[PDB]
Amino acid sequence: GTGVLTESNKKFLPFQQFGRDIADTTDAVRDPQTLEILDITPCSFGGVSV
Amino acid sequence: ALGKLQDVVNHNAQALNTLVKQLSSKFGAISSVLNDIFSRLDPPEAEVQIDRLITGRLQSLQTYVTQQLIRAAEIRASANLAATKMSECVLGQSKRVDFCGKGYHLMSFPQSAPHGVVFLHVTYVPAQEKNFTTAPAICHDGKAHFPREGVFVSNGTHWFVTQRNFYEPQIITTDNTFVSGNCDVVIGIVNNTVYDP
Amino acid sequence: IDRLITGRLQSLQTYVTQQLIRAAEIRASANLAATKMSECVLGQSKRVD
Amino acid sequence: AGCLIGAEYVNNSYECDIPIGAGICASYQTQTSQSIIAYTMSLGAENSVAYSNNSIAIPTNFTISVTTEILPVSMTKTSVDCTMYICGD
Amino acid sequence: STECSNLLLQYGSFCTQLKRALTGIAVEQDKNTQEVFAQVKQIYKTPPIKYFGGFNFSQILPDPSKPSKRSFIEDLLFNKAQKFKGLTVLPPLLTDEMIAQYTSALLAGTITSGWTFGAGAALQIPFAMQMAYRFNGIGVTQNVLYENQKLIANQFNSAIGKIQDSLSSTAS
């Protein structure tokens, strides 16, 4: 996927790796070889009006 | 001023243009020419892209019909509203506020227009107001009097009775008042005298 | 991908149609409320009920 | 609603000409070269009327005005062909 | 999907009609929000003295203490979601502050004029005389009011007080 990687203050149980949101979308991940709670955010976009 | 009448015409023109342009669009086919398709592809495979084309065309026609129905609903609503407004304004005077223009409704004149109707409402707007001293009622020697159709006003020295739409000072007589109780219950009573012809 | 985009376009068209149908009634209710306000606040009315 | 690039915010208040959003209205107005300016729309002027216990206002003149109103009554008619719009020859 | 946009244009032009419909819906919503509130040109204000013959209006007039500038009833009614994949919500043109100012100006103009501010120039008239003139529109004379003004004001105050309690009780 694509997005910005940040750090969230979440406490995941030591058996889960993925992360889902209310709208069935990925929102949180786990560092494979570091075990750190990472947070993803969608890339910047929007509309243009003249 | 004719934007409301030109809007529906522009919408119909845009819908017709879109319906005409939707034909030149391949709905998952190699080309749009049915003759070229039937000449190039084999008869077995010729019954694949034509199905998608006819499905897309039927969907476009259904969407057009739905939009036409949605527009005709509002057109009928507006026509019924205009008919009611005409029947209430032209033949008969109405007392509904803000309905027959801004002001006191006096008359109306209908006019014709392409796919529309124009109304001319005549109103009544007062002007040149002036401040005056008012009072609820006046007190006689042993009785009270209330205005029948008007309001007691004063220019500073004398008292008169005028209507609530045009300043017309008139003397206070017994032909425009009525006795009801005495001067012990109204808050703000004033002492004066009435004229008896 | 053709079937997917066709289904998504059909869903979007259904959503737009539902939005238009709802906005029609919303406009009707707004016009009714505006008429009621203009008849009630801006003067006394004699219409029963 | 976003970031407006190409206009300056004026601390005055005028009528709304081009609606932007959240009460913001843009207008091509002179600042004294003419440029697009941005400001907050005004609802109207102040007309505070006095009010006492023994005051009344009776008019002395009147005027006659004539207004107009436009209302659509109908539209145009349409009729398409079934076998001609779907199939050619 | 840099290759998904290639076959998107092959099905025709569908983004123009839907965007036009959404823009029309937005303009219609703005016009509906305007044609209900924006009906007067002059913004009337309330006088400092709040002795309107004996009738209390402290529950409908805007409260200047709080920054919201709303009345007591509007607070109870008021005190009672992100971009998923491109769905954006456009903010309205008229704000809650402007709507509250319009409502307050309308209420002040009503209380000050009666039924003349909506038909012409603003004409001042006492509230007692306004009620006496309104009572004649149904058959009741003016002496009934001039006698039972106290009872009518008490009943009006009781009804205004009970309206808020009923609104707070009913949650539907």
Curated annotation (Swiss-Prot), chain D:
Record note on biotechnological use: Main component of the anti-COVID vaccine Chadox1/AZD1222/AstraZeneca; in which the human tPA leader sequence is added in N-terminus to enhance protein secretion.
Subcellular location: Virion membrane; Host endoplasmic reticulum-Golgi intermediate compartment membrane; Host cell membrane
Organism: Severe acute respiratory syndrome coronavirus 2
Entry-listed glycosylation sites: 11, 30, 32, 53, 61
Family according to the record: Belongs to the betacoronaviruses spike protein family.
Record note on what altering residue 48 to L does: In strain: Omicron/BA.2.12.1
Effect of residue 27 to A: No effect on O-glycosylation by host GALNT1
Protein name: Spike glycoprotein
Resulting phenotype, residue 32 to A: Complete loss of O-glycosylation by host GALNT1
Outcome, altering residue 45 to V: In strain: Beta/B.1.351, Iota/B.1.526
Domain notes: Contains sequence and structural motifs very similar to those of a bacterial superantigen and can directly bind and activate T-cell receptors. Activation of a broad T-cell repertoire may be involved in the hyperinflammatory syndrome in acute COVID disease.
S-S bridge residues: 16-25
Note from the entry: Variant D614G has become the most prevalent circulating sequence in the global pandemic since April 2020. The mutation is associated with higher viral loads produced in cell culture and animal models. It would not change pathogenicity nor neutralization properties vs vaccination. May be prevalent because the mutation increases virus transmission in human population.
Description of post-translational modifications: The cytoplasmic Cys-rich domain is palmitoylated. Palmitoylated spike proteins drive the formation of localized ordered cholesterol and sphingo-lipid-rich lipid nanodomains in the early Golgi, where viral budding occurs. Specific enzymatic cleavages in vivo yield mature proteins. The precursor is processed into S1 and S2 by host furin or unknown proteases to yield the mature S1 and S2 proteins. Processing between S2 and S2' occurs either by host CTSL in endosomes, or by host TMPRSS2 at the cell surface. Both cleavages are necessary for the protein to be fusion competent. Cell surface activation allows the virus to enter the cell despite inhibition of the endosomal pathway by hydroxychloroquine. The polybasic furin cleavage site is absent in SARS-CoV S.
UniProtKB/Swiss-Prot annotation, chain E:
Site feature (Cleavage) residues: 70-71
Glycosylation site residues: 56
Superkingdom field: Viruses
Function: Precursor of the fusion protein processed in the biosynthesis of the S protein and the formation of virus particle. Mediates fusion of the virion and cellular membranes by functioning as a class I viral fusion protein. Contains two viral fusion peptides that are unmasked after cleavage. The S2/S2' cleavage occurs during virus entry at the cell membrane by host TMPRSS2 or during endocytosis by host CSTL.
Protein name per its UniProtKB record: Spike protein S2
Organism (species): Severe acute respiratory syndrome coronavirus 2
Lineage start: Viruses, Riboviria, Orthornavirae, Pisuviricota, Pisoniviricetes
Annotated gene: S
Portion of the full-length sequence here: 746 to 943 of 1273
